[model samples]
Every structure is written in structure tokens, then in C-alpha cells.
Target: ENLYFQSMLIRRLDHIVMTVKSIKDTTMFYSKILGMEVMTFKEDRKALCFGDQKFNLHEVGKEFEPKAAHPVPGSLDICLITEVPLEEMIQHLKACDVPIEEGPVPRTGAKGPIMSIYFRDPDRNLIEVSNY
Candidate 1:
């Protein structure tokens, strides 16, 4: 008597678009501080690439149409997993002068229990780095 959808076709998230005030700062923060690669596509569009996923950057006033109904900056809260030990990550964040909003505390991940550390991006988007 399983209740979950049986005909589901979705596999995983491929990418998401984020609205930001400054594309340069946002790109720098994710590429430098978070270690994601910056990719330019369609000749002008930019994205932050990490692992198998990516985040498309949309400049505040220059966003592409057919976007979110309410695409807003500083509104996204996302958790990212990392293999680096939490302690090392703390030291790294300190060296980079990025402030931690919270944690090295216990949290529930998509799979199970994980230790997480929280911070914010240049656009004030909440970022959580975690490890199993």
C-alpha cells in the first residue's frame, strides 16, 4: 500500500535561477568563497556550477522573462553538502572573512542526520554547508 507517486519522472534538480543585485559580487562569492565554478552560457548568461547542479544568475533589473512569479533577492535558503570536515570549513570561512550565521550543529539532511554550518551569500541568500 505505498502512498508515494508511482509514475514520477523527476530525477533530480538540474538548476535554479537566483535574482541578485550585483552579478559580479555574487559570482565572486560563490566562486571564491564557496568554490563553485563560474560558467558563462548563451553568450551572456552566468551560472555557478558545483557538482552536478548549478545556479543561474539573474541580475535584479535585467532578469530574463518567463521567470518566477516573485523572484526576489535574499529570499532563497539552500543547504549544500561538503566533504570537508566542519572544523576545517570553519577555519576556511574565518580566513575568507565570511561570517557564519549559525551552526556546526545537528540538522536533518535529505538522506538523514547531518552536521551543518550556515552562512549567507553576497545577496544575503542563506547557505547551509553540511556533512553526513
Candidate 2:
């Protein structure tokens, strides 16, 4: 088929726009817990930068057009690869008063297997932090 990839075309993910209920809460939780750097762009736009990727935040009911057909917060389940040891990350999370929803359990990641710890963000979005 003409559409089938003759070679690898797409390289990597750059960013994702997340629909959120409160920008302040989202930014705070991610920064304090995950060590993501908060960024402001286009004057008022807020995003969380980590590694080489980012999550552009769109406060609910004020989302820019041309977004996901059904944009909603708490609907995303994202996995982040981390360098922090699982035990140490667990300790940090506990110190932050964030609840551990599940895991330091096994799961398959993009490259192969990983040990992940699951938790919820302020908007209740499921976040998986993993070590390969």
C-alpha cells in the first residue's frame, strides 16, 4: 500500500496539549512532585517541561480550537520514564503527600519491561513513572 511506511517517517513525540481543570493545581502538582519545569509561553500559555517533551495545558472551557474531538481532563494515562530509583521515588512521593494509586509493579513500556509506580495528578489523570 502507498500509505504503508517504506521507511520510518515519524521520529519522536514533542508535546501533548492536555485539557485541565485548573492550571495552577496542575502546574504545582507536577513541579513539586515530578520535578517538571514550569514554562509560560505566548504570554499566558502554561506548560510543563520535562526531559525533551512537554505538556501544554489548556484550562477547561477555554480550550483553543482544533483540539481533540472530546477534550477532557483526568482521561489521560501517561507513562514517564525516570532515572530516579523506584524506592527513592516512592519516598519522595510519600513526602509530598500524594497518594500512590498503584504499583512499583511490572508493566510493558515503549522499549520493553518496566517497573512503574502509579499515581493521580490534581485533575486525577493517571500518571505512571517507570524505570526500565
Candidate 3:
């Protein structure tokens, strides 16, 4: 008997779902900051897609509360990797008065040369905007 495994075809991330206090704010942030297109769905109140990856924002009926703990490893952080101009992004974020936790600083990673900024959505879910 031959023992061999064939690689099954698997594509990129399909979607990421997050509970939000306001779908409108989440949608606006993603669309404006990362340049992701807002995708239309009959059942979805708000959704966005970048490349082949999608993000679904669900209305959970809660105040925008900051999380008491950091996100679990390998959980989810909704990162945006881009080579776009960083200063412009920062200015836009400031203009919008988005709550930023950290700056677009250089960080060491497994991959090399990464810069990131952290912020929260209306639901206070952490979002990391990064570039390499």
C-alpha cells in the first residue's frame, strides 16, 4: 500500500465575522482607512471585502465598550497590510477622531520590517493596521 497525501485546494480567507455596537462605524472605518469595498448582502446589515477576504459586522446591541483584555492568540485582529502612504492615514484617523492606542511604529516580526498602529472599532474590538 502506498501512503501519500495530495494537497487539497484551499483559497484565501473567505470572511471574518465580528460583533459590533454600530455596523455603520465599523463599515466606515474599514472602507475609509483600508480602502476595502463595502460588499452588499441581502441578509447583512454591514459587510466589507478586501481582495477575497470579507468582514461581516453584526449588530449586537451594546455600548461601545473597550475590552478589558487583549485578544487571544490566533483569534482575530482584522489587520490591513498596505504600502499606502502612512502619514495620510494617520491624519485621516486624527481628523475622524478615531481612538488610537498605538502609533505607526516599527515592530519586529517573524517576517521583516513591519510598522503598525492599533485602534478600536465602535465595539472596541482591536484593529491593527500594519505594513511591511
Candidate 4:
């Protein structure tokens, strides 16, 4: 017999909220340095889009009506997949002057083991770029 939940299964992630102090610098870091596409929504909603997902940017000291419970800066640690290989990604990082906090080391992804390189956004949130 198969072992599967009868209830509706939870699918993949759509997005995640990252509280940032400087939207300009943070967005630039993700967009320019990491080569992601930046998108905007009304009333100051901004996101860094890549693959089929995005990271919603919320300003820490802004007129944000709806927000995360007790939002704080430098509080997120998220890993993202990259299409480019580790070597090319290193070149991209070098051109932007964004320091790598850690590897092209081995780590596990949702699908299994992945190679990853870690860095920090402007707010000092840990961001990992990985490849399977």
C-alpha cells in the first residue's frame, strides 16, 4: 500500500519576506550583484525575482501597514538555486565586489545534495547561492 497523505499536499514555496533597512542597497545587491530581476508593487512592495520564486523586500523602518510579526533586520538565512556553475558564479561575485562568506561547499537541498556559496545582503542576512 502507498503511504501518502490524503489531505492536500503543500507545494513548493512562492516567496519569502525579508526585512531590510535599505531597500535600495539590498535590491541592488540582489539585482546587480547577483543578476536577479527586481520587481515592484504598489505602495512600496519590492521583490527580487529569479527562477519561479521571489524574495519580497520589506523595509524595517517604513510605513508598512501589513508586516511580519516582530520583523527584524538581518534575520533571514535562505538558499537559492543558480543556473550557472560555481566557477562562473564566482566571477560574477568578483565583478561586483561582494565577498563570499563561505563555500562552493557541499550542502543538502530540497531535492538532495547541492553545492553552495554563501554571502550576505546589505542588511547582513545570510544568502546562499547553490547548484544541484
Q: Write the residue-wise lDDT of candidate 2 on 1-132 in tens digits.
A: 546774556668999999999999999989999999999999989999998999999999999878999998999999999989999999999999988999889999989999999999988899999999
The lDDT-based order of candidates, best leading, equals: 2, 1, 4, 3
Q: What C-alpha lDDT do the candidate models reach, one value each?
A: 0.92, 0.93, 0.67, 0.85
Check candidate 1 and list the clashing pairs. Answer: none
Worst 10 residues of 4 by lDDT: 1-10
Per-residue lDDT for 1-132 in model 1, tens only? 234665464568899999999999999899888899999999989999999999999999999988999989999999889988889999999999999889889999989999999999988899999999
Tell me how candidate 1 scores on lDDT: 0.92
Candidate 3 stretches with Cα past 4 Å from truth are: 1-11, 43-45, 61-76, 108-110
Which residue pairs show collisions in model 2?
A: none
The residue-by-residue lDDT of candidate 3 on 32-114, one tens digit each, is 76677887776545578877677765555532245324322224566676676667778778988886799888866446877
Candidate 1 regions with alpha-carbon error over 4 angstroms: 1-10
Q: Name the candidate that leads on TM-score.
A: 2
State each model's C-alpha RMSD to the native. 2.3, 1.4, 6.3, 2.9
